[PDB]
Amino acid sequence: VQLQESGPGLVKPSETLSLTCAVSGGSIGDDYYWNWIRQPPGKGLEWIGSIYGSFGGTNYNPSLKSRVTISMDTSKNQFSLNLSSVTAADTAVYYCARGSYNIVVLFGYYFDYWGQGVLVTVSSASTKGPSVFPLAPESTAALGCLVKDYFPEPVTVSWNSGSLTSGVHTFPAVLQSSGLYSLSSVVTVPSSSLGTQTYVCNVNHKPSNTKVDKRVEIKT
Amino acid sequence: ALTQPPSVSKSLGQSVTISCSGTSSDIGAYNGVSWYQHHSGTAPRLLIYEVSKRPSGVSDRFSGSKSGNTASLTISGLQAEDEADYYCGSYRSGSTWVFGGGTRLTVLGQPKASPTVTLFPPSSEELQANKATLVCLISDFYPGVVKVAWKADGSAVNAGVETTTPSKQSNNKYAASSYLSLTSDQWKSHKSYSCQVTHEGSTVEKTVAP
């Protein structure tokens, strides 16, 4: 039983935020509550609303009720969120979550399974793809990649298509006064391996379709 | 809403209780208060449900109770792991669901750790675009406070510096990074640049050069 949010990571102020949750390992039509929950970075959790799988009834957070629509699709096994006329207050990590229960009238319900969450940024700023620069490289050596000047979050970085995980450290991004982000990812490797083993950082910034595998070599 | 202490500070090994004050329309209307743990980078984690039940996977150290309209989470034998935000929540008659405001739990007494510093010069291809970004990566330190100083030929550099707020690594130490954004002309105009990280009165410095 798994849930997965998807949708645009960037929405302009006053527009409508739309998200979908794909549910696996169980029928959405079963006797569960299906929920949308959000958390602005650095702030608290907030229940948005629910749709009841068996009968399709919705309940919404009263402070959001006028702007919120929750739907479900029995085929596809999905339910979704529409949040209209957004502002920067709506910038948040959005989660879908299953609400299970025993009896409800005696016990209410609780959220046992959650999606991984999707960040949605509400901003009028333009999407901007990063530049990806190698950070070129004793018994041990640090090498890396600079992912420079992008918007919005997030960027993902893996190494050698996910086969190199040991010694990898991807750093949280800096937000510069420009309004653009930069992050770096570093891997420490044996120096004897250099010139033999190839190291490639796999960078993805989906909002800008910037998908780069950058080879990192010692400077010559 | 449901009211929690914003902050609680305790020491390793000790026990802590976090309260959650609601109404007779939620906490006092059902045996349906639940508790969630949240670390940055992961979905909230269910700790307690139906006031005091633990799902499989949640340790013995977590327990829940309620009295009237106030629910309580107790965590025993506090470890570095337990540093997180904790939320209570409840169904509310007869139709909605409400989270507590959250409680930031700090666990003190963790071992001091000095930072490791890695400094990279600009790449060749960035320079070809007439820019130069120096990257100072700072890792494995505790507590999570550092001061960064950049120098060019031993002179202080104030312009072009951006430095992140420290964030926890998986190993419960902190990481941070500092970026010095220059032009290529600037980079080539000096003999060297240094990143100096000061942590609890001790300093670690790295230098790069064109």
Side-chain angles (χ1 to χ4, degrees):
Chain A
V1 39
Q2 313 148 95
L3 295 73
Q4 174 86 330
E5 309 84 349
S6 65
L10 179 59
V11 181
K12 292 180 178 291
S14 305
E15 295 184 349
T16 299
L17 181 157
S18 288
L19 290 180
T20 303
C21 180
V23 172
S24 299
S27 185
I28 289 216
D30 292 332
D31 286 310
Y32 294 99
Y33 293 79
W34 301 102
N35 298 265
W36 284 104
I37 292 152
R38 64 177 182 182
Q39 184 167 34
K43 298 178 190 177
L45 296 172
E46 176 177 52
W47 181 77
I48 297 167
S50 72
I51 186 158
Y52 188 60
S54 303
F55 294 91
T58 57
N59 293 279
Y60 302 127
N61 184 319
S63 79
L64 297 170
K65 191 155 45 186
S66 74
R67 298 191 292 131
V68 172
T69 302
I70 297 166
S71 302
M72 56 184 288
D73 191 347
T74 74
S75 67
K76 306 181 197 180
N77 221 40
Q78 300 171 1
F79 67 112
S80 48
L81 170 64
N82 276 7
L83 197 99
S84 62
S85 76
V86 295
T87 75
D90 295 304
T91 290
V93 178
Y94 286 78
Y95 299 95
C96 52
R98 193 184 78 179
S100 64
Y101 61 91
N102 185 16
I103 291 174
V104 181
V105 300
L106 301 178
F107 302 108
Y109 56 90
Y110 62 96
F111 314 118
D112 49 14
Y113 287 94
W114 297 64
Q116 52 171 35
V118 56
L119 177 63
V120 184
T121 297
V122 184
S123 170
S124 60
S126 313
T127 303
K128 174 77 170 325
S131 294
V132 178
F133 295 120
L135 299 177
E138 282 176 332
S139 61
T140 254
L143 57 88
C145 290
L146 170 60
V147 184
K148 182 191 169 187
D149 286 340
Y150 66 89
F151 185 83
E153 290 264 55
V155 166
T156 58
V157 187
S158 67
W159 284 88
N160 292 348
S161 302
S163 72
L164 177 60
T165 55
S166 178
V168 175
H169 194 339
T170 299
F171 285 70
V174 73
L175 176 53
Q176 306 214 149
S177 57
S178 71
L180 303 171
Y181 294 91
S182 295
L183 70 67
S184 302
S185 177
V186 177
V187 59
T188 66
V189 306
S191 293
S192 57
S193 82
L194 305 177
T196 299
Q197 174 67 45
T198 80
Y199 298 103
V200 179
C201 65
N202 317 112
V203 180
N204 201 351
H205 184 244
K206 296 181 167 176
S208 65
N209 192 15
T210 299
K211 176 103 184 321
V212 174
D213 308 301
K214 175 115 302 188
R215 178 156 87 357
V216 183
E217 285 176 339
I218 187 49
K219 168 109 204 317
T220 168
Chain B
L2 271 39
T3 306
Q4 309 181 218
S7 289
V8 288
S9 212
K10 234 63 189 168
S11 289
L12 279 177
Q14 290 185 316
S15 218
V16 64
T17 295
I18 295 175
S19 65
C20 168
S21 175
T23 78
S24 295
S25 298
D26 33 82
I27 294 182
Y30 312 99
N31 296 285
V33 64
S34 51
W35 290 89
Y36 305 83
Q37 174 193 67
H38 180 238
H39 293 98
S40 298
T42 6
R45 173 198 176 194
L46 175 74
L47 298 172
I48 296 286
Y49 69 96
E50 288 175 31
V51 182
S52 66
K53 291 191 177 66
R54 264 158 36 241
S56 61
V58 170
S59 159
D60 180 22
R61 297 189 295 112
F62 296 89
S63 62
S65 67
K66 83 172 169 143
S67 175
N69 290 331
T70 296
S72 297
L73 179 73
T74 295
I75 319 175
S76 72
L78 289 172
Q79 310 166 354
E81 273 74 25
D82 303 331
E83 283 201 325
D85 298 329
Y86 293 87
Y87 297 87
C88 61
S90 181
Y91 180 69
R92 174 174 281 183
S93 24
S95 37
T96 52
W97 211 97
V98 53
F99 282 98
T103 297
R104 269 256 157 79
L105 169 64
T106 291
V107 181
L108 298 179
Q110 302 177 49
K112 305 277 200 300
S114 300
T116 50
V117 175
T118 311
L119 173 60
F120 294 100
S123 71
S124 269
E125 219 182 316
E126 184 182 31
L127 293 172
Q128 212 57 44
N130 305 128
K131 300 303 188 61
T133 307
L134 287 54
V135 183
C136 191
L137 306 162
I138 317 161
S139 58
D140 293 331
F141 57 96
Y142 186 94
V145 177
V146 289
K147 195 157 179 185
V148 182
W150 290 87
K151 300 192 180 307
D153 295 332
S155 310
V157 182
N158 312 294
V161 182
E162 295 280 0
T163 305
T164 65
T165 299
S167 57
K168 286 236 231 168
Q169 299 158 174
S170 53
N171 75 348
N172 294 328
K173 303 178 178 170
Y174 287 89
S177 55
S178 190
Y179 291 76
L180 171 54
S181 297
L182 309 164
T183 68
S184 61
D185 284 348
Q186 289 178 307
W187 166 247
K188 293 171 305 206
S189 78
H190 292 98
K191 285 258 305 167
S192 79
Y193 279 85
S194 301
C195 179
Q196 305 179 4
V197 180
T198 304
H199 179 260
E200 304 283 281
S202 291
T203 305
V204 177
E205 175 188 280
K206 290 292 186 186
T207 295
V208 292

PDB file of all heavy atoms in Angstrom, chain A residues 89-107:
ATOM      1  N   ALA A  89       1.198  32.093   0.700  1.00  0.00           N
ATOM      2  CA  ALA A  89       0.790  31.331   1.876  1.00  0.00           C
ATOM      3  C   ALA A  89       0.550  29.854   1.534  1.00  0.00           C
ATOM      4  O   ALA A  89       0.488  29.000   2.421  1.00  0.00           O
ATOM      5  CB  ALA A  89      -0.463  31.940   2.489  1.00  0.00           C
ATOM      6  N   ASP A  90       0.419  29.550   0.249  1.00  0.00           N
ATOM      7  CA  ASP A  90       0.066  28.201  -0.155  1.00  0.00           C
ATOM      8  C   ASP A  90       1.290  27.405  -0.588  1.00  0.00           C
ATOM      9  O   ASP A  90       1.177  26.228  -0.913  1.00  0.00           O
ATOM     10  CB  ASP A  90      -0.973  28.240  -1.266  1.00  0.00           C
ATOM     11  CG  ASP A  90      -2.300  28.838  -0.797  1.00  0.00           C
ATOM     12  OD1 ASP A  90      -2.870  28.326   0.191  1.00  0.00           O
ATOM     13  OD2 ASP A  90      -2.759  29.825  -1.408  1.00  0.00           O
ATOM     14  N   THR A  91       2.444  28.066  -0.601  1.00  0.00           N
ATOM     15  CA  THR A  91       3.724  27.394  -0.808  1.00  0.00           C
ATOM     16  C   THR A  91       3.912  26.390   0.316  1.00  0.00           C
ATOM     17  O   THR A  91       3.855  26.765   1.488  1.00  0.00           O
ATOM     18  CB  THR A  91       4.901  28.388  -0.822  1.00  0.00           C
ATOM     19  OG1 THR A  91       4.835  29.183  -2.009  1.00  0.00           O
ATOM     20  CG2 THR A  91       6.262  27.648  -0.778  1.00  0.00           C
ATOM     21  N   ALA A  92       4.121  25.123  -0.036  1.00  0.00           N
ATOM     22  CA  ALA A  92       4.158  24.057   0.968  1.00  0.00           C
ATOM     23  C   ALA A  92       4.519  22.709   0.374  1.00  0.00           C
ATOM     24  O   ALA A  92       4.388  22.490  -0.834  1.00  0.00           O
ATOM     25  CB  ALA A  92       2.776  23.957   1.689  1.00  0.00           C
ATOM     26  N   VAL A  93       4.968  21.796   1.228  1.00  0.00           N
ATOM     27  CA  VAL A  93       5.021  20.401   0.838  1.00  0.00           C
ATOM     28  C   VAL A  93       3.623  19.817   0.996  1.00  0.00           C
ATOM     29  O   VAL A  93       3.065  19.848   2.088  1.00  0.00           O
ATOM     30  CB  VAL A  93       6.021  19.591   1.684  1.00  0.00           C
ATOM     31  CG1 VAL A  93       5.989  18.131   1.258  1.00  0.00           C
ATOM     32  CG2 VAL A  93       7.438  20.166   1.539  1.00  0.00           C
ATOM     33  N   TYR A  94       3.059  19.300  -0.094  1.00  0.00           N
ATOM     34  CA  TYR A  94       1.729  18.705  -0.064  1.00  0.00           C
ATOM     35  C   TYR A  94       1.822  17.180   0.019  1.00  0.00           C
ATOM     36  O   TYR A  94       2.567  16.566  -0.744  1.00  0.00           O
ATOM     37  CB  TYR A  94       0.925  19.127  -1.306  1.00  0.00           C
ATOM     38  CG  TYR A  94       0.468  20.561  -1.227  1.00  0.00           C
ATOM     39  CD1 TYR A  94       1.348  21.599  -1.498  1.00  0.00           C
ATOM     40  CD2 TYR A  94      -0.847  20.885  -0.868  1.00  0.00           C
ATOM     41  CE1 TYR A  94       0.950  22.916  -1.399  1.00  0.00           C
ATOM     42  CE2 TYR A  94      -1.253  22.207  -0.766  1.00  0.00           C
ATOM     43  CZ  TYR A  94      -0.348  23.218  -1.027  1.00  0.00           C
ATOM     44  OH  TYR A  94      -0.729  24.541  -0.932  1.00  0.00           O
ATOM     45  N   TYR A  95       1.072  16.588   0.951  1.00  0.00           N
ATOM     46  CA  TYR A  95       1.033  15.141   1.132  1.00  0.00           C
ATOM     47  C   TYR A  95      -0.346  14.573   0.872  1.00  0.00           C
ATOM     48  O   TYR A  95      -1.353  15.203   1.202  1.00  0.00           O
ATOM     49  CB  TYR A  95       1.426  14.738   2.559  1.00  0.00           C
ATOM     50  CG  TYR A  95       2.815  15.129   2.978  1.00  0.00           C
ATOM     51  CD1 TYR A  95       3.039  16.306   3.682  1.00  0.00           C
ATOM     52  CD2 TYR A  95       3.907  14.311   2.686  1.00  0.00           C
ATOM     53  CE1 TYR A  95       4.322  16.666   4.077  1.00  0.00           C
ATOM     54  CE2 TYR A  95       5.191  14.663   3.073  1.00  0.00           C
ATOM     55  CZ  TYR A  95       5.387  15.841   3.768  1.00  0.00           C
ATOM     56  OH  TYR A  95       6.648  16.192   4.164  1.00  0.00           O
ATOM     57  N   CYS A  96      -0.401  13.365   0.318  1.00  0.00           N
ATOM     58  CA  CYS A  96      -1.641  12.617   0.401  1.00  0.00           C
ATOM     59  C   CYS A  96      -1.437  11.515   1.425  1.00  0.00           C
ATOM     60  O   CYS A  96      -0.332  10.995   1.586  1.00  0.00           O
ATOM     61  CB  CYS A  96      -2.080  12.057  -0.956  1.00  0.00           C
ATOM     62  SG  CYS A  96      -0.851  11.096  -1.862  1.00  0.00           S
ATOM     63  N   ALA A  97      -2.505  11.171   2.134  1.00  0.00           N
ATOM     64  CA  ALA A  97      -2.392  10.216   3.220  1.00  0.00           C
ATOM     65  C   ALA A  97      -3.679   9.395   3.337  1.00  0.00           C
ATOM     66  O   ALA A  97      -4.778   9.913   3.114  1.00  0.00           O
ATOM     67  CB  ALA A  97      -2.082  10.946   4.521  1.00  0.00           C
ATOM     68  N   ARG A  98      -3.533   8.118   3.658  1.00  0.00           N
ATOM     69  CA  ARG A  98      -4.689   7.272   3.916  1.00  0.00           C
ATOM     70  C   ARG A  98      -5.142   7.427   5.358  1.00  0.00           C
ATOM     71  O   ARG A  98      -4.324   7.373   6.274  1.00  0.00           O
ATOM     72  CB  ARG A  98      -4.371   5.802   3.636  1.00  0.00           C
ATOM     73  CG  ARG A  98      -5.613   4.920   3.588  1.00  0.00           C
ATOM     74  CD  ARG A  98      -5.240   3.453   3.394  1.00  0.00           C
ATOM     75  NE  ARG A  98      -4.781   2.856   4.645  1.00  0.00           N
ATOM     76  CZ  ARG A  98      -4.412   1.584   4.776  1.00  0.00           C
ATOM     77  NH1 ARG A  98      -4.447   0.775   3.735  1.00  0.00           N
ATOM     78  NH2 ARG A  98      -4.014   1.123   5.954  1.00  0.00           N
ATOM     79  N   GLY A  99      -6.444   7.613   5.556  1.00  0.00           N
ATOM     80  CA  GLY A  99      -7.010   7.652   6.890  1.00  0.00           C
ATOM     81  C   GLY A  99      -7.699   6.343   7.198  1.00  0.00           C
ATOM     82  O   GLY A  99      -8.678   5.983   6.544  1.00  0.00           O
ATOM     83  N   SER A 100      -7.178   5.608   8.171  1.00  0.00           N
ATOM     84  CA  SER A 100      -7.818   4.368   8.561  1.00  0.00           C
ATOM     85  C   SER A 100      -8.445   4.549   9.933  1.00  0.00           C
ATOM     86  O   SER A 100      -8.177   5.526  10.631  1.00  0.00           O
ATOM     87  CB  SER A 100      -6.820   3.206   8.544  1.00  0.00           C
ATOM     88  OG  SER A 100      -5.797   3.394   9.499  1.00  0.00           O
ATOM     89  N   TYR A 101      -9.298   3.615  10.318  1.00  0.00           N
ATOM     90  CA  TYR A 101     -10.055   3.770  11.556  1.00  0.00           C
ATOM     91  C   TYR A 101     -10.543   2.424  12.054  1.00  0.00           C
ATOM     92  O   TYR A 101     -10.393   1.407  11.370  1.00  0.00           O
ATOM     93  CB  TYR A 101     -11.252   4.697  11.339  1.00  0.00           C
ATOM     94  CG  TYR A 101     -12.198   4.150  10.296  1.00  0.00           C
ATOM     95  CD1 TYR A 101     -13.263   3.324  10.651  1.00  0.00           C
ATOM     96  CD2 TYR A 101     -12.006   4.433   8.952  1.00  0.00           C
ATOM     97  CE1 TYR A 101     -14.120   2.810   9.694  1.00  0.00           C
ATOM     98  CE2 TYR A 101     -12.856   3.924   7.989  1.00  0.00           C
ATOM     99  CZ  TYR A 101     -13.910   3.115   8.364  1.00  0.00           C
ATOM    100  OH  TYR A 101     -14.750   2.612   7.397  1.00  0.00           O
ATOM    101  N   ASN A 102     -11.148   2.443  13.238  1.00  0.00           N
ATOM    102  CA  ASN A 102     -11.806   1.282  13.795  1.00  0.00           C
ATOM    103  C   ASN A 102     -13.327   1.472  13.737  1.00  0.00           C
ATOM    104  O   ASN A 102     -14.035   0.660  13.138  1.00  0.00           O
ATOM    105  CB  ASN A 102     -11.325   1.043  15.229  1.00  0.00           C
ATOM    106  CG  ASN A 102     -11.886  -0.234  15.835  1.00  0.00           C
ATOM    107  OD1 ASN A 102     -12.395  -1.111  15.128  1.00  0.00           O
ATOM    108  ND2 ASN A 102     -11.787  -0.346  17.157  1.00  0.00           N
ATOM    109  N   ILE A 103     -13.824   2.559  14.331  1.00  0.00           N
ATOM    110  CA  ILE A 103     -15.270   2.764  14.466  1.00  0.00           C
ATOM    111  C   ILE A 103     -15.706   4.221  14.164  1.00  0.00           C
ATOM    112  O   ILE A 103     -16.860   4.475  13.800  1.00  0.00           O
ATOM    113  CB  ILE A 103     -15.734   2.314  15.889  1.00  0.00           C
ATOM    114  CG1 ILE A 103     -15.630   0.783  16.011  1.00  0.00           C
ATOM    115  CG2 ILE A 103     -17.148   2.784  16.200  1.00  0.00           C
ATOM    116  CD1 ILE A 103     -15.908   0.231  17.403  1.00  0.00           C
ATOM    117  N   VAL A 104     -14.762   5.150  14.280  1.00  0.00           N
ATOM    118  CA  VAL A 104     -14.920   6.584  13.938  1.00  0.00           C
ATOM    119  C   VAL A 104     -15.757   7.358  14.946  1.00  0.00           C
ATOM    120  O   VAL A 104     -15.274   8.334  15.507  1.00  0.00           O
ATOM    121  CB  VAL A 104     -15.544   6.848  12.533  1.00  0.00           C
ATOM    122  CG1 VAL A 104     -15.639   8.354  12.286  1.00  0.00           C
ATOM    123  CG2 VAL A 104     -14.712   6.227  11.437  1.00  0.00           C
ATOM    124  N   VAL A 105     -17.005   6.941  15.171  1.00  0.00           N
ATOM    125  CA  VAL A 105     -17.861   7.647  16.124  1.00  0.00           C
ATOM    126  C   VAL A 105     -17.254   7.565  17.526  1.00  0.00           C
ATOM    127  O   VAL A 105     -17.509   8.421  18.374  1.00  0.00           O
ATOM    128  CB  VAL A 105     -19.322   7.091  16.147  1.00  0.00           C
ATOM    129  CG1 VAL A 105     -19.968   7.227  14.777  1.00  0.00           C
ATOM    130  CG2 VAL A 105     -19.355   5.648  16.612  1.00  0.00           C
ATOM    131  N   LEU A 106     -16.433   6.540  17.752  1.00  0.00           N
ATOM    132  CA  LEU A 106     -15.754   6.356  19.031  1.00  0.00           C
ATOM    133  C   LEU A 106     -14.282   6.755  18.970  1.00  0.00           C
ATOM    134  O   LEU A 106     -13.695   7.110  19.999  1.00  0.00           O
ATOM    135  CB  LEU A 106     -15.865   4.902  19.496  1.00  0.00           C
ATOM    136  CG  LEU A 106     -17.276   4.347  19.691  1.00  0.00           C
ATOM    137  CD1 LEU A 106     -17.227   2.876  20.111  1.00  0.00           C
ATOM    138  CD2 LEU A 106     -18.055   5.180  20.699  1.00  0.00           C
ATOM    139  N   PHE A 107     -13.692   6.706  17.772  1.00  0.00           N
ATOM    140  CA  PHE A 107     -12.235   6.801  17.647  1.00  0.00           C
ATOM    141  C   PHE A 107     -11.726   7.756  16.570  1.00  0.00           C
ATOM    142  O   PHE A 107     -10.512   7.910  16.420  1.00  0.00           O
ATOM    143  CB  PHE A 107     -11.642   5.407  17.378  1.00  0.00           C
ATOM    144  CG  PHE A 107     -11.968   4.387  18.441  1.00  0.00           C
ATOM    145  CD1 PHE A 107     -12.865   3.361  18.182  1.00  0.00           C
ATOM    146  CD2 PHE A 107     -11.373   4.452  19.692  1.00  0.00           C
ATOM    147  CE1 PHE A 107     -13.172   2.423  19.160  1.00  0.00           C
ATOM    148  CE2 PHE A 107     -11.673   3.518  20.673  1.00  0.00           C
ATOM    149  CZ  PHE A 107     -12.577   2.501  20.405  1.00  0.00           C
TER     150      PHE A 107
END
